[PDB]
Design a protein around this ligand. Structure first.
Ligand code: GSH
Ligand code: GSH
Lengths: 232, 232
């Protein structure tokens, strides 16, 4: 199989994992664990990479790095990246828009003073999401009725964002419908329910959000109602 | 012409600007100025965008947003994105690796306590760059002897990084050779020396680095030599 390295985190790779699955493609993962980072430094220069970074993708021919480079390579192999220039460009538009929410969590995630940051980013969230809620206007998926790589990306993004505020998605039904429809894939279904599936962490174990070492209780403030009532 | 919006900043668009030039492609820019941001909000929802964000690219057919989506669309139109899947994937590997340095400046740029941040990021710089200095091993450019979209990207990245520490590039000759070779293009040459060329800011005018409103003197510390001597 094509060999793939990452940390035992959802992180950047979750979407390529998801995509690898849905294609019924034999792949072998190289999963580094928090302590294991020792093992990384040595192999960091050995396995003939050109831009040695994680996540990596070893194959017969291709010897790749860079998260987009990996995903696009699987979907491209498969005829999913698009036919006609303009379409191919729309796909990456979707990709880009996706990666703002998911990279948006990333760019806050580790900052100690998360609590305060969360606020500002979340303020903007409803706008970013409406974009998709609107693009899901009489669509099964992002870019018509077939899956595309960015569908799993909005999925890793939505999966991520629910961990900030589980309620954030109630204002956008079609998005919730989207998450239900993705998982309804027999391939998505069985996966999320297997040994292989990395359910956490969401970020590197150092991270203030989607981090620590185990699935998330509070670390916060709620707001719910005036004095001592409503505590989500 | 295909119409393109941004701020009167180098920023994200500098590379698409550079690429648009080298292709001898008629384009009309829509450049918003610092005060002008008023004009943005109204047109933000009017001009039939799907993911209304800056930079935008209006054409006959395509109505696009997202910085990668724009660049890749010009080069794709032109047969530059790659022939065979693996190659196309290497291109975006290059793209990705590029965008770590350039996004690396971005993610520090605005933080008030730049001075301190700069340190850490710069620490890592020589590693990131060696990658390219090595990939320039008996190459004219990134990915052989033809230009590719990422060549302008390493250019916008190197152009950017010299503004932190002008010396950072002395350890990597081939990179300096690269910058000389890019600019040697009659199209790059004439451009950088025209009315059209946005020489500054580098970031949004709010930014602590590559910002303010005008080309950069100090705001810093040097280190040069022990007590009061060597002040770069
Ligand atoms: N922009 C990322 C580059 C990767 C990244 O910055 N690396 C992380 C992923 S969690 C890693 O932990 N890097 C360790 C390293 O430098 O060796 C991509 O496209 O994959
Ligand atoms: N990730 C960027 C998205 C753009 C971005 O975050 N926008 C900046 C570029 S300086 C802008 O100022 N945005 C204003 C807006 O939200 O309308 C891309 O691919 O183009």
């Amino acid at each position: 199989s094509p060999i793939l390295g990452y940390w035992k985190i959802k992180g950047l790779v979750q979407p390529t994992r998801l995509l690898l699955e849905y294609l019924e493609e034999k792949y072998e993962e190289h999963l580094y664990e928090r302590d294991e980072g020792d093992k990384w430094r040595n192999k960091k220069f050995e396995l003939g990479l050109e831009f040695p970074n994680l996540p990596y993708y070893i194959d017969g021919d291709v010897k790749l790095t860079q998260s987009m480079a990996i995903i696009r390579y699987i979907a491209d192999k498969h005829n999913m990246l698009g036919g006609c220039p303009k379409e191919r460009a729309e796909i990456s538009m979707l990709e880009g828009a996706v990666l703002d929410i998911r990279y948006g969590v990333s760019r806050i995630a580790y900052s100690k003073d998360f609590e305060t940051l969360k606020v500002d980013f979340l303020s903007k969230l409803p706008e970013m999401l409406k974009m998709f809620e609107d693009r899901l206007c009489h669509k099964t998926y992002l870019n018509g009725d077939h899956v595309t790589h960015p569908d799993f990306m909005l999925y890793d993004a939505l999966d991520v964002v629910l961990y900030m505020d589980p309620m954030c998605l109630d204002a956008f039904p079609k998005l919730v419908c989207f998450k239900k429809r993705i998982e309804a894939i027999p391939q998505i279904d069985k996966y999320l329910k297997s040994s292989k599936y990395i359910a956490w962490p969401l970020q590197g174990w150092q991270a203030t959000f989607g981090g620590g070492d185990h699935p998330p209780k509070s670390d916060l403030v709620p707001r719910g109602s005036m004095e001592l009532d409503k505590w989500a």
